[PDB]
Amino acid sequence: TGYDLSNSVFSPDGRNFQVEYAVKAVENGTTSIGIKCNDGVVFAVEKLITSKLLVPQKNVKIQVVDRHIGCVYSGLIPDGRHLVNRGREEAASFKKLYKTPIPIPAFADRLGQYVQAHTLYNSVRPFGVSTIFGGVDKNGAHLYMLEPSGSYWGYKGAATGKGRQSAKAELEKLVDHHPEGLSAREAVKQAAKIIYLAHEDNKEKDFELEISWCSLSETNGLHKFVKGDLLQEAIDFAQKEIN
Amino acid sequence: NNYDGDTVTFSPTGRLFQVEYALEAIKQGSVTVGLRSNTHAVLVALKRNADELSSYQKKIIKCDEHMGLSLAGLAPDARVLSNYLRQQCNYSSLVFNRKLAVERAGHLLCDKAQKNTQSYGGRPYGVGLLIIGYDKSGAHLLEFQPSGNVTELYGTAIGARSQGAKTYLERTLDTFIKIDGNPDELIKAGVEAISQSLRDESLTVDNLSIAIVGKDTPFTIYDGEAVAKYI
Amino acid sequence: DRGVSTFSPEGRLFQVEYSLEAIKLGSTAIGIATKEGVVLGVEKRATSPLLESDSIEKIVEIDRHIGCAMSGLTADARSMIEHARTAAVTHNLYYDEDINVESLTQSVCDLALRFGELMSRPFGVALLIAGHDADDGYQLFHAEPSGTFYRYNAKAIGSGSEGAQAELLNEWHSSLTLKEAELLVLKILKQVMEEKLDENNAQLSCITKQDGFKIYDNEKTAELIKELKEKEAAE
Amino acid sequence: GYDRHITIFSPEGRLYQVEYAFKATNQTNINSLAVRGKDCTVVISQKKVPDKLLDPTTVSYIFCISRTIGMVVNGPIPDARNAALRAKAEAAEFRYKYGYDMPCDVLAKRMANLSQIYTQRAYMRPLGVILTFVSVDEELGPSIYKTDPAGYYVGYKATATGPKQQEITTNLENHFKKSKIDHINEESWEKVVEFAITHMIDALGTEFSKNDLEVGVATKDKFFTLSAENIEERLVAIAEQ
Amino acid sequence: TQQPIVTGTSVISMKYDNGVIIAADNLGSYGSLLRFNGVERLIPVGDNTVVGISGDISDMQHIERLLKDLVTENAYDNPLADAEEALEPSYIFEYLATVMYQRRSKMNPLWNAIIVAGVQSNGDQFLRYVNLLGVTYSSPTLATGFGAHMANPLLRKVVDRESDIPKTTVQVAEEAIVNAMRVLYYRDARSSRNFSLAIIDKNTGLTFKKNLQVENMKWDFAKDIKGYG
Amino acid sequence: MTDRYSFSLTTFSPSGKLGQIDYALTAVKQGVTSLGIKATNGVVIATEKKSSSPLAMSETLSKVSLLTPDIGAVYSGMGPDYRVLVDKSRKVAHTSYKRIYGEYPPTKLLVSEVAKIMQEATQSGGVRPFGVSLLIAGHDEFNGFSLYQVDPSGSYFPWKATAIGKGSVAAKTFLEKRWNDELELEDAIHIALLTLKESVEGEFNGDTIELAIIGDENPDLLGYTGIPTDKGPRFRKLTSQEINDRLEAL
Amino acid sequence: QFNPYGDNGGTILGIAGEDFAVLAGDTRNITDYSINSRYEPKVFDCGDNIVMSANGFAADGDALVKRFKNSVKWYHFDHNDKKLSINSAARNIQHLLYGKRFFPYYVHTII
Amino acid sequence: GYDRALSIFSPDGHIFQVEYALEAVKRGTCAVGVKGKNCVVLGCERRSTLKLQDTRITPSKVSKIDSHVVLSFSGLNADSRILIEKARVEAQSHRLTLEDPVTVEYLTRYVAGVQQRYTQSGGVRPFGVSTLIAGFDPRDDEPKLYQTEPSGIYSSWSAQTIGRNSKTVREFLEKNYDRKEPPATVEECVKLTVRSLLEVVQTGAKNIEITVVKPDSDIVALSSEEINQYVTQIEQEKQE
Amino acid sequence: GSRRYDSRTTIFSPEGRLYQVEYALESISHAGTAIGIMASDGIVLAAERKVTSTLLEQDTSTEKLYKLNDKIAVAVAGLTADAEILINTARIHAQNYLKTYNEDIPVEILVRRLSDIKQGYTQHGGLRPFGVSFIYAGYDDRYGYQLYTSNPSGNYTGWKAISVGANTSAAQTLLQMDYKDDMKVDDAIELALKTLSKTTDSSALTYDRLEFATIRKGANDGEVYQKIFKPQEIKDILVKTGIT
Numbered sequence A: 001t002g003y004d005l006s007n008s009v010f011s012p013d014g015r016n017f018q019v020e021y022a023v024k025a026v027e028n029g030t031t032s033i034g035i036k037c038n039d040g041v042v043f044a045v046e047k048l049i050t051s052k053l054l055v056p057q058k059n060v061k062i063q064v065v066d067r068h069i070g071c072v073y074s075g076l077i078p079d080g081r082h083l084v085n086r087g088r089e090e091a092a093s094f095k096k097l098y099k100t101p102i103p104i105p106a107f108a109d110r111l112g113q114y115v116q117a118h119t120l121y122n123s124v125r126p127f128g129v130s131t132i133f134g135g136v137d138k139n140g141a142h143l144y145m146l147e148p149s150g151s152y153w154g155y156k157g158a159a160t161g162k163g164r165q166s167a168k169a170e171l172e173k174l175v176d177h178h179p180e181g182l183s184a185r186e187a188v189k190q191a192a193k194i195i196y197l198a199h200e201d202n203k204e205k206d207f208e209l210e211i212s213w214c215s216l217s218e219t220n221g222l223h224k225f226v227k228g229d230l231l232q233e234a235i236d237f238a239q240k241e242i243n
Numbered sequence B: 001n002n003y004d005g006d007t008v009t010f011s012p013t014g015r016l017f018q019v020e021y022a023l024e025a026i027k028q029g030s031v032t033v034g035l036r037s038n039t040h041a042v043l044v045a046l047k048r049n050a051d052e053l054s055s056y057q058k059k060i061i062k063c064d065e066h067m068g069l070s071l072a073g074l075a076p077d078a079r080v081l082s083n084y085l086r087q088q089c090n091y092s093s094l095v096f097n098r099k100l101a102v103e104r105a106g107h108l109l110c111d112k113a114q115k116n117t118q119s120y121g122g123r124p125y126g127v128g129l130l131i132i133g134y135d136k137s138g139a140h141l142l143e144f145q146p147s148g149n150v151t152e153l154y155g156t157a158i159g160a161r162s163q164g165a166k167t168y169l170e171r172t173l174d175t176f177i178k179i180d181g182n183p184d185e186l187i188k189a190g191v192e193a194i195s196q197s198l199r200d201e202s203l204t205v206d207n208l209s210i211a212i213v214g215k216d217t218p219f220t221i222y223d224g225e226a227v228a229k230y231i
Numbered sequence C: 001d002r003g004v005s006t007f008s009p010e011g012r013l014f015q016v017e018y019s020l021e022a023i024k025l026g027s028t029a030i031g032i033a034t035k036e037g038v039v040l041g042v043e044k045r046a047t048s049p050l051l052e053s054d055s056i057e058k059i060v061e062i063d064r065h066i067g068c069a070m071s072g073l074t075a076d077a078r079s080m081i082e083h084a085r086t087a088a089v090t091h092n093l094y095y096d097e098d099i100n101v102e103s104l105t106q107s108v109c110d111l112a113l114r115f116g117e118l119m120s121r122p123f124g125v126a127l128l129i130a131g132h133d134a135d136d137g138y139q140l141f142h143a144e145p146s147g148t149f150y151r152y153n154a155k156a157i158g159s160g161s162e163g164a165q166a167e168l169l170n171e172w173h174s175s176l177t178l179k180e181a182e183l184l185v186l187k188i189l190k191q192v193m194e195e196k197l198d199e200n201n202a203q204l205s206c207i208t209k210q211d212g213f214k215i216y217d218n219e220k221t222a223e224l225i226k227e228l229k230e231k232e233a234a235e
Numbered sequence D: 001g002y003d004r005h006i007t008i009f010s011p012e013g014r015l016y017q018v019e020y021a022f023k024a025t026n027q028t029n030i031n032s033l034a035v036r037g038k039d040c041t042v043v044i045s046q047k048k049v050p051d052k053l054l055d056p057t058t059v060s061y062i063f064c065i066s067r068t069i070g071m072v073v074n075g076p077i078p079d080a081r082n083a084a085l086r087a088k089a090e091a092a093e094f095r096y097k098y099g100y101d102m103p104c105d106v107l108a109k110r111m112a113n114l115s116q117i118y119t120q121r122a123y124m125r126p127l128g129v130i131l132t133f134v135s136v137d138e139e140l141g142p143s144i145y146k147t148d149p150a151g152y153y154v155g156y157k158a159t160a161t162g163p164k165q166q167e168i169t170t171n172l173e174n175h176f177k178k179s180k181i182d183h184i185n186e187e188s189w190e191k192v193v194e195f196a197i198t199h200m201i202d203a204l205g206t207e208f209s210k211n212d213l214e215v216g217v218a219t220k221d222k223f224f225t226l227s228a229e230n231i232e233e234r235l236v237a238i239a240e241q
Numbered sequence E: 001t002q003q004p005i006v007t008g009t010s011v012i013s014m015k016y017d018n019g020v021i022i023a024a025d026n027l028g029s030y031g032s033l034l035r036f037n038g039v040e041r042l043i044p045v046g047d048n049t050v051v052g053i054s055g056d057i058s059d060m061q062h063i064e065r066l067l068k069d070l071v072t073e074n075a076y077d078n079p080l081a082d083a084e085e086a087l088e089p090s091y092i093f094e095y096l097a098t099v100m101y102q103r104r105s106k107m108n109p110l111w112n113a114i115i116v117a118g119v120q121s122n123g124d125q126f127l128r129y130v131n132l133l134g135v136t137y138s139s140p141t142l143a144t145g146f147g148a149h150m151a152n153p154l155l156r157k158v159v160d161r162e163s164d165i166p167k168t169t170v171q172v173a174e175e176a177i178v179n180a181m182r183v184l185y186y187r188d189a190r191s192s193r194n195f196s197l198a199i200i201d202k203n204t205g206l207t208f209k210k211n212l213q214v215e216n217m218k219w220d221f222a223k224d225i226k227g228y229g
Numbered sequence F: 001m002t003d004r005y006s007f008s009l010t011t012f013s014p015s016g017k018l019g020q021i022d023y024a025l026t027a028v029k030q031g032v033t034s035l036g037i038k039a040t041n042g043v044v045i046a047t048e049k050k051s052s053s054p055l056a057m058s059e060t061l062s063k064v065s066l067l068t069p070d071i072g073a074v075y076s077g078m079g080p081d082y083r084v085l086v087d088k089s090r091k092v093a094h095t096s097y098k099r100i101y102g103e104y105p106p107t108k109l110l111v112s113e114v115a116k117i118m119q120e121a122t123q124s125g126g127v128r129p130f131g132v133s134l135l136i137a138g139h140d141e142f143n144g145f146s147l148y149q150v151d152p153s154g155s156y157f158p159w160k161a162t163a164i165g166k167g168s169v170a171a172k173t174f175l176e177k178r179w180n181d182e183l184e185l186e187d188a189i190h191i192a193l194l195t196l197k198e199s200v201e202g203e204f205n206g207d208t209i210e211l212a213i214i215g216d217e218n219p220d221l222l223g224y225t226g227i228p229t230d231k232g233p234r235f236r237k238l239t240s241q242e243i244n245d246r247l248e249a250l
Numbered sequence G: 001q002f003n004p005y006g007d008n009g010g011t012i013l014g015i016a017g018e019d020f021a022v023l024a025g026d027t028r029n030i031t032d033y034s035i036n037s038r039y040e041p042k043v044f045d046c047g048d049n050i051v052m053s054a055n056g057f058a059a060d061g062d063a064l065v066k067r068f069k070n071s072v073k074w075y076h077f078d079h080n081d082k083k084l085s086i087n088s089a090a091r092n093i094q095h096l097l098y099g100k101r102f103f104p105y106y107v108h109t110i111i
Numbered sequence H: 001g002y003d004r005a006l007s008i009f010s011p012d013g014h015i016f017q018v019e020y021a022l023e024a025v026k027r028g029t030c031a032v033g034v035k036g037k038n039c040v041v042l043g044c045e046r047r048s049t050l051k052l053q054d055t056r057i058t059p060s061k062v063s064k065i066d067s068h069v070v071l072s073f074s075g076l077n078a079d080s081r082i083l084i085e086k087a088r089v090e091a092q093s094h095r096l097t098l099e100d101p102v103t104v105e106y107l108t109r110y111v112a113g114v115q116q117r118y119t120q121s122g123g124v125r126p127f128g129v130s131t132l133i134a135g136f137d138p139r140d141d142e143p144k145l146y147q148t149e150p151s152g153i154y155s156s157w158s159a160q161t162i163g164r165n166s167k168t169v170r171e172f173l174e175k176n177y178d179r180k181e182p183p184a185t186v187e188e189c190v191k192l193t194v195r196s197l198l199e200v201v202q203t204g205a206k207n208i209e210i211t212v213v214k215p216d217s218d219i220v221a222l223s224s225e226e227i228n229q230y231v232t233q234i235e236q237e238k239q240e
Numbered sequence I: 001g002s003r004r005y006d007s008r009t010t011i012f013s014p015e016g017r018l019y020q021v022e023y024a025l026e027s028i029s030h031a032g033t034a035i036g037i038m039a040s041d042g043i044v045l046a047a048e049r050k051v052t053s054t055l056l057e058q059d060t061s062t063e064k065l066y067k068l069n070d071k072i073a074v075a076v077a078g079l080t081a082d083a084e085i086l087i088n089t090a091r092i093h094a095q096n097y098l099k100t101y102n103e104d105i106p107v108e109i110l111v112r113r114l115s116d117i118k119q120g121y122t123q124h125g126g127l128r129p130f131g132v133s134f135i136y137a138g139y140d141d142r143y144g145y146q147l148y149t150s151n152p153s154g155n156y157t158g159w160k161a162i163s164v165g166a167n168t169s170a171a172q173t174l175l176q177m178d179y180k181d182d183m184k185v186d187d188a189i190e191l192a193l194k195t196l197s198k199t200t201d202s203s204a205l206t207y208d209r210l211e212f213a214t215i216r217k218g219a220n221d222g223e224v225y226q227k228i229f230k231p232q233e234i235k236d237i238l239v240k241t242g243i244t
């Protein structure tokens, strides 16, 4: 034994235990989801209200990369911010050299290679976040989810954090019941519901819902936050479904 | 246990013990309170002395004309982080002729602290900070933890016995947020809040430290006979 | 083994806490601040009678208006003194003035936590920095290897510190003269020293606005020891 | 027992971290196969999409390294993509410096040399992947060269990699013992893919749908991957005889 | 150190009661060759700022990319990016001025003269100049290159000092700018007939006018002119 | 990141042993047998092509490698370690000799350079020793024919004949009985084949045996005519057919 | 060849009284024979009861004043809000200027 | 580069690597320094476990740092060469910049500073060496004798010894050396230095080295026969 | 991180010893014995090759005796590969000195330089020390014929006669018994061989198990010759001295 004390060490199984321990920090975090719709993507996240003294709507969790990519994550929030900062550097250098904004699969690999690099040496710690991200490019909408190991795939729907099993089940129903696809406005409503349903795993404290989206028709392929009447409409839809 | 030797090592339950031990240094530190209205933001800090011959350790640091913080934990780490804030406020002014937003100041502090939690050789910061400021979107109060987590709040407290002051502010939330255009009453509410964390000792003239920033009020620190009015 | 910059479960840096133990083994140093000046006094503690005690330099000039006394691993203090002298002179070059005593102390304390895997360990020495400036008058500071510094009306460091500090608690008042402070340092040094106090195994110094920082002659200190003996026999 | 944590010799002259990297190779539970035709080189790999929430088009362990070279990986995807990015960079740099397309065997050697370094230098871990490179080389013709975490590499007449490699290996051995030639004597690549799939079915004892397989084909001057519908056409031809 | 290759000529501008106006022609000159006839040299930043650039076109396109990146960067982790924490004209100018002075200080200048025109949050008119040397100045009217010599005199007859700004309407200001562009077309050998004009008003916002032409030209008197003496 | 292993991973134990070097030698012992024999008019080096799979094309794996036109090398131990050493050995023959003196290095000096690289992996920071022993055969004008062994420590020794790896102890005894100072090259090849047969279990033929010589100059392998002083490489790898011809007269 | 310097004209005048001091300067900014601005402030309040003007090449002048204003700000941070005396400000400006001895600020400064 | 913190504090406030460097000094051959009224003498022990030695060429224990200052040591011989070299370079650098040779105190302060630096620098171990530095300041006739140790502390001594059995010879010096009246002549000072070593040495043959330093760069090493005459005279007085 | 695996090669023990130096010396005690003897008219260097084979090519072999320049040679005891690294450094240092001053390097200066390099590996860098002890035999016009030794600590000392490697205790006692100051080279040759013959762990001392070298002013007039003995010449001197 001792194989789990140092990062980048293969155990006799062929496992990196430090990466698996980083997953535990992700599983401890709040629930965050992603839904791929007809011409775009929707992101939503659970924000636990630890106290009345938290200013409502101020502690924003979802982050924009470039102008067309949204990123949300569960686990150690600072680690997620560090990864987004890198993503922003990667997207900037891509656009500097190649003019066009970074495609989503291209962007996915940039994050993937960077996260994977933090599993190669014992001088660094793996990322304590699973990141759900995506947006719209020239080839359409793309949704990705990226783990502490550096592993990522494309998704129809994605979920991570403490209420991931609940969320995944709800996402799987949407895939089955909508083979033709889901609209952007529908996906916002459904995203609200899924976070409210996933909040049963964090039922002790009340929470604040935060949603964002990139859609070709609804936002011109740019990342925007859901605000005001459209946010309240999604909250009302969510509250109606739990009762 | 076996996973607390350095900051580069997760525990089997996904915890970072060196970061948690750095968090413990804040709890040992002296109490400090932060609260705000829509016009002003206030810091109140209980300063700690070594003995009766010694001075009371300063808790509040000015970062700019419109921004500053109070500390709890390792004071030299607060000096490093406050110096970094001073530079970032200053860069924003010199390059962009722009006062640095309080929210953006929080983001920079988060990212600086994070790098020390993911690399071998270094150590996490051993201090917690309460940043107040007045910018283009009004008054603000931030809480910084050396884990990297920065939070925007109406009011809060950090340090030893900070839970008492935090509960008081949670009750008084609806009252003190409305104290607009009245700096003295907002400080009174902060002094009354920090009083809920005192045991055995009381607020004296060289014990208490208060700072305020607002609409037509630069970040100014009050010590000595300037706070006798509020005792 | 374990990191040099490691935190304990209580939230303290192991190496800093351990360096504080080395300072407890060091020879006693005392400082008293008055409105007429600040006095600094040390125990020399020669390991053998063949050691020429006047070569023991535990009180040191930083600038004309700032002095410094040390306790602990005194070899570690040399680079701290060098930096302090450089900081004091550099500020005079940049600003055509004397540097504030606090600002000098802060500059020294910035070195303290520059260790890791920069220097390999913290300093194993504590400093009493005494001085005068126009803004805050006569001042005494205690600079630790933690990077923390406290201002003091009076302070003792080293092996006899807690016994001396309790004595300074009773004796210090805001109306002390310089002469009264000199005798008080000598009295408390004599109390905590192993060997019998004389002009060869103890050293006095002061800082005044008029004359600046001065290390006392062995002849001058000898008279103040004789003055102390007589006034204690007076009741 | 720190000789098991980093790449230094154990008392038996063994490198345990290298041996454990070989074990990580089978973590995906995927089997791959490669064969050579007259004019082509074919590589097939199992495709498993266990989650319904996944986009199946993005799940792949076959990589287009250069125009001529293809690479299938046996091992976790992060290490696979690490190796893929590097091989792409190396192949492009080669062409720039030396004025011709990097041969398949030379790229294999280069990646094997990089892998060797991770077995000798302590700070770098081995990648938990086996890399099978395929092309139709302009000098050597159809080529299969495979690299592992030890830094070993060699050319192959045909090869197999994964948990059930031995079953596939023996099946291929028995075929080449009959035919007494170093390749599949077939004109079209379509029939060489059909051969590859047929002999995987025989060796594993499992049937495949269009979504259960992943196919790469190397011809003169290009390597390409087949779509689900191209594979379906291949499966239909197998079933009809 | 370099030499400018493909260049743009005058940028002209002025303040009026409720805002600012800025204009520049659509030519990219290659020495005496009038090479490129569709070059936009007024670059808007948000809905409150227009940056007008003259001099080297390759360096202009670089600056255009910096401003594009500045908008992206400001939006990062900024919920008030389209409100209280949007980019101000003063922020955009100071940034450019910093870059220009830094570049001249490394002996590798961006070979340009730049005018930043806009309206601030509080309604105040913003108009300030910066060039390849990092030199900055503000005035009720500003112009670059030939415009400094020919446009400013005409524009200064409308707004001569600060107190003339509230007395100057948008109609009078635009008229003066358009006339100045005609004068420049008569007299600048590196100018074109086609130009762009931008108005930034505190009430009506940013109005960007493309494909404008110099009109009402006096040439008829040329027929009577014969010989040289 | 950064390589933070700046310290030695090979150190002296209380008994004066360098553990990592001993363990590297153990890895060499497990390796396949290779040998070298020196004749009056040549040198022969040989080894078994232990194919990992019959599907593998063992011709693409070269255990016997040309270092210079007149110098060749074979190994026992870890094959990947050998491959990178061959690359470094080929390069150092140019950078530290041919680009200076305009001629290829003599055998003993190239060996010295290879030895140096192997020594440095025994003392430098954050690296393990090379897990191979090399047998380097070569010719040069002033020293004539020579054969050297190089170990993981960096130590090297000249030999009349020797063997390394799996069955080296038995093979060296076999060579002691057969070697004399009057052997022609063909006699040394014959003895090499006889010696190598003892340590081989399975198939013994030109396809499973790798054998090369350092002998006469081969003008047919030079690739150009017209310069009288250039007469071609003395290193020649024997073909599969050439080996099988000498296995009939065995 | 690129010339990093220019001349923005202008004139400034400082007079010290018994218990007061004045620093005056014209507001005209020029290049060659053109007027850039009729009102471009050249004398600046730098805090701590100090006024400054750096006349000559305006880019260097603005850079120097900006850096000195910054030096006043950091003097307050580093030395407990102590007032920067005029003599201390003068010595500080010498170091700002001599720091670019081999690529000078092309200005004549008065405080 | 190798950055590992080898010299660190322990829970009881000790730096073991510095303390273990002192144990290396304890193992080293005995060295002694005695200053008279107008001279300083440096005595050194030579262990007689090594015969068949070539004494002409073998590194001598006392080293000239400049024409007016000498350095002897106890501890690791290889380590001492590094300190001697650095000291010699600094001596010439001081002459070059100040236009005056180093004072004995300055040279001591420098060497002690180097030793200190190696107790809080990454990747290095402390010097296993203590030194006795002796000489006369330029244009000064007052004798100077200083000591340094691995920690980097230094001090001036009327008389001092370092190395193995230094506790014994210090005992001797503490009862035999009078401060009010130090050895008035070269003879008296050398005699007292030889006497102090004879408490520890074994045979008075080739085991004692003596170097006399006088003012104005007057340094000489005594030969075997000259020292042997002191050894003879001491024991003949002792037989009484 | 990486600290976990660091052996810390440059630390003191509680007794004030350098672990790695002590263990390197233990390694050297198992190496073949090397002897140096200094006479009035020259220096002898004799050394025993370790358990050889009949198939070792002896006439082209060199493991013990190396030439540093025309005036200085070294006998090696320890890791041969480690020695060659240092030997090449010493050869370069000698040439650097010759280029700078246009005079052959004095023996001690060369010895001090190599010894300082060894010292550095014990104080900094975190690397293992060189497992090598040298005997230096050399001549210069200042001190004449000189013998030195250096070991992994970087300490060096001068000698009239000395041994390194195996059985140094026994060898040094035999040398201490029969060595005299007025001895000549021919007598020193005989002493060196007789000492090796008695201390050897082999059954008998033969030509194939020895490396031999002299540094003589037996060079026509006022100059110094280095003679590395050939296998046949070692065989002849063994018969002459009556050992075989």
Ligand SMILES: [Cl-]
Binding pocket: D109, D110, D113, D114
């Ligand atoms: Cl390579």
Ligand SMILES: [Mg+2]
Binding pocket: D006, D007, D118, D119, D120, D121, D122, D123, D124, D125, D126
């Ligand atoms: Mg490794």
